[PDB]
Symmetry: C3
């Protein structure tokens, strides 16, 4: 009778060992991870890269007759027949100027390049930048690097490219960061006389705070800043460490692109777009990097734009961009105050030779800074390693039947002898 | 002497095994969890449901003499004695309209319904919606579905109700989302001539971005949008998975509500309120769902409001809403640009046959989109499961005394003799 | 041949046990932790303390001739030679007043000057409501910061009970209508260090256990808008060494009852200024002597700036293990509505323009009646290590602690 109770106890114990062991094994092959959040104080923080664009792509006073000829349809200033659209709400002077530039009688077309057009007709930072301050000391427009995006000629402060060393901040708070007073030059905006898809009613700038290791993607990752306010941006540096397969989904390999030195998801997207447009239309857009020839406005109309839209719509499988394992993100909180005060309106108007109306509707102040001298870390950590797996299997294997790998080897010994 | 040192080693080993084993047991019985954060790229994102209200509950030009008679005191247009309050700083015409509407001389009242009054007097989406675009293609006011909230007649885009399929976005950024130009119609706002508790000075709209599975709760979960700016709202889809008892506190059961098909904490809140008001006052407010009769303004005055206030403090234990285990939340970052530009102000003024002053104080553009085509996941994960407990107990049990469950069974066997 | 493969299996098995066991040993000695996020529903939430300053340090109408004499250079209204700045863009009345106050023919405490000349909450506070019930200016406690005379609602200091809210949403919180008094702003005729073009207020939402640090931790609120602030209470629990970096011993400073990272920062600053200049600035607390405007120019400011740059290691403030933080999301609506501008203008005896350029409404509340908890939790405890080493020790060679002791015996005998 005792051998029966022993047989039942050994059988049930071996069954429990079976299901528990297969449980821990399956849990290991899920490759599970859990997250470790930490806050690290630092004596210094590397200030990020700040890219800003004017919402107006190009200045009206800088557009020329040749520009209307080649890119008149693309710039939406002229209709398909090289004639001005509906004149509703058209200033007499502006409409006469445009009508004069669109005469096109005995006109010899000069050579035209999209990057030349954006570079000269775009808003000059030397005119927009009314004042610059970093850590309380003056900055020059030479700190701003020209970057071409979908919005046109844009500028990146502290880009850290072309061998310039990146700036640091040793104190947090509103004073100890970037602080620029900009004039968005609303007088230079393209007149809107007729409704169009490209017609926009916004006035202000668009800013993206990003690491120097990634290029700007201002059309998607930027936030707007409106004239007439001083906007504060409190930043919190975040350092992210992800896990590669089979734990998570990250880009383990450096994967350097021909266009960009360091791999980033932004660089992967704009690289994918660049390759697609170069293959499909044999030309490259203004914002894209490389050595390819830039598109002509005819190529823009008949190939480039429908090609990108078709790439977005047809299938995401062509452009699948994984996230790198080491990522520096910047968190940001926005707040506003009014500019200028009644005590300063006259002084600003006289300082920049403008009317107080103009100052009120054209001046914005951007204040970008770190809230405090610390950074957060978010790390994906492996939850079950092979040492822990063997430890649990050994513990339960020793608890239920008290056997070992040598014991199973001995049972296989008798099986081979049998 | 050797058996004595052996006895000391076995005793100390058995004590240590005792305290370590009870340690792992107690840690298991705390039922602990830890969190798994992950970010997932996606080729498509389901666009959320967007509900907005005008801050002005009902239009002044649509209020009628009968409305003043029944709900004049409730709307704060008339005083306790059904008379207009002080006319201080009242436009002559503006007051003339109200004085004529509140005559009540030889007036034979007609039936009155609160939901009819809000549905007819509230701001019409056909007049507010100056332009609508979703993913660059035009939308109609018919895309917005009417929901009645505490703020009055409100509208939900991509509500996904009545069999409509939920919309998706295949690109991120400002262009590729919902983008509406609204006229908040500040001329239709209730005149404020005298101080009252209900008096408010704000002008604009209130928006809540929420999953289609939940009803809006704009009085608590909404954010404001001011006229004269294009407000960008960058959304981040977050997918949350919680643990039921005994690990955490989540809804293990489906939790069928009578009013709503899907369970949500909001649906639980307005369910608690609706049930409480039906039991105490036998009527429901406009925002509440169901089939009960709507309250009359007298019922609102003498029963509903004090009942809700008594519900907040006295019965704070009475309404307990557990959180569901699988929840889709949307995070948001707001930024603004100025509207309109000087190059467009007059074109807007002529396009909508308004003065530039009006455009300046009445037009707002709302741009709701996903920052990028990805979603975050926040999961509560069990930290100590029974397999790990048995493995650790077996490991320490085998390290300290080298025993097994069969060893203790044999010890009970020898003890049996 | 069988004993040879048995011996090799025991050798290799002991090697595997060695590397796995040392693996768990080293992993345990990393002292790792992982994060636990949780959301806790509550019937009540303790409302935070809200400190706000006007961006304008002191009122122009309250400055007197003596104040111009002593602190004229510091306040930037007068130059080093006690003369008026450039007369470009100067109000005729303001310039006549300043020249008259600067007559300096036949003609001071910093805290008296800030306390009396600063913006009075009794004039700024046009309306106050908390949970729908009226509040008085006496509920705000005066705190002196770098911005000047500032005010803290629900400060909870001096034994006052902390306020609670039993409902979430815009109505059920603090709601104040303020007049920033833009007419009292210092006239700016020439460039100066204090010169600012902003108009509005600065707010910091913080727990009562920590002092305000509004020049660094504040956000702006612009006039002409009602800004809503949705708050989410967060409770953070950190680990002390060797797991993390937290202050296990509170080691509260004499200046403040409860230890906070901010309180440690301003304590270090006060101590440094007392050591180098034998005086304390306006914002600093204690019983120490306040600086004179001459002391400010030649000692205080360069000492503070040099303290930030020269020795950043000197002030090391550890983070406490239990920290209550408040998350916040801002949004705006326009104030006043066209239907309400006239009533406000007449109610407060101002022009409709003045209301447009001076009135702001602040609405601070909890989004919902819950709070988040973020806890650092130990990933490998000594019981788990002994369990893993025991499991692998029993799987690979099947030995025990008693087995190793017996091996020491048999080795000792032979
Ligand atoms: C990602 O960041 C980690 C640190 O956060 C890097 O790990 C360091 O790698 C260097 C080798 O170049 C070592 O000298 C350091 O000791 C490592 N630090 C730690 C904490 O392990 C890692 O190399 C980075 N990965 C990439 C691809 O850049
Ligand atoms: C200010 O600008 C106007 C615009 O052309 C110009 O005529 C005037 O001379 C300028 N004044 C000064 C002082 O430069
Ligand atoms: C435009 O509005 C005015 C009143 O403001 C009205 O008289 C006129 O008929 C309107 N025109 C159109 C085309 O609606
Ligand atoms: C810290 O806060 C937690 C709740 O978040 C509480 O349980 C604990 O008692 C507090 N004190 C310590 C020393 O952890
Ligand atoms: C109202 O404002 C005027 C203009 O400054 C002032 O003279 C008058 O005294 C004010 N009324 C009161 C009651 O303060
Ligand atoms: Ba009752
Ligand atoms: Cl997992
Ligand atoms: Cl727990
Ligand atoms: Cl670790």
């Amino acid at each position: 009778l005792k051998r029966v109770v022993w047989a039942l106890c050994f059988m049930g114990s071996l069954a429990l060992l079976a299901l528990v062991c297969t449980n821990r094994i399956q849990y290991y092959f899920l490759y599970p991870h859990v997250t470790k959040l930490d806050e690290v104080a630092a004596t210094r923080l590397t200030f990020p890269a700040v890219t800003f664009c004017n919402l107006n792509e190009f200045r009206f006073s800088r557009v020329t007759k040749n520009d209307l000829y080649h890119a008149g349809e693309l710039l939406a200033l002229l209709n398909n027949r090289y004639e001005i659209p509906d004149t509703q709400t058209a200033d007499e002077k502006q409409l006469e100027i445009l009508q004069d530039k669109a005469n096109f009688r005995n006109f010899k077309p000069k050579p035209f390049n999209m990057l030349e057009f954006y570079d000269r007709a775009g808003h000059d930072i030397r005119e927009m930048l009314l004042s610059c301050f970093f850590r309380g000391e003056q900055c020059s427009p030479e700190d701003f690097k020209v970057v071409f995006t979908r919005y046109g000629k844009c500028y990146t402060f502290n880009a850290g490219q072309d061998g310039k060393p990146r700036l640091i901040t040793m104190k947090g708070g509103t004073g100890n960061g970037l602080e620029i007073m900009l004039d968005i030059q609303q007088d230079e905006y393209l007149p809107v006389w007729g409704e169009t898809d490209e017609t926009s009613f916004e006035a202000g700038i668009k800013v993206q705070i990003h690491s120097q290791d990634e290029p700007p993607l201002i059309d998607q990752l930027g936030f707007g800043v409106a004239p007439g306010f001083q906007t504060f941006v409190s930043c919190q540096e975040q350092r992210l460490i992800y896990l590669p397969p089979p734990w998570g989904d990250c880009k383990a390999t450096t994967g350097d692109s021909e266009f960009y030195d360091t791999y980033s998801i932004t660089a992967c997207r704009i690289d994918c777009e660049t390759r697609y447009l170069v293959e499909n239309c044999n030309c490259r857009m203004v914002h894209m990097p490389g050595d390819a020839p830039y598109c002509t406005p005819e190529q823009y109309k008949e190939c480039a734009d429908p090609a990108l839209d078709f790439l977005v719509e047809k299938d995401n499988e062509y452009c699948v961009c994984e996230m790198p394992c080491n990522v520096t993100r910047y968190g940001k909180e926005l707040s506003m105050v009014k500019i200028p005060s009644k005590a300063s309106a006259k002084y600003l108007a006289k300082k920049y030779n403008k009317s107080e109306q103009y100052i009120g509707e054209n001046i914005l102040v951007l204040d970008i800074f770190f809230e405090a001298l610390n950074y957060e870390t978010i790390e994906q950590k492996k939850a079950y390693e092979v040492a822990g797996l063997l430890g649990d299997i050994g513990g339960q294997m020793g608890l239920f039947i008290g056997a070992s790998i040598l014991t199973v080897l001995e049972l296989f010994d008798y099986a081979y002898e049998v």
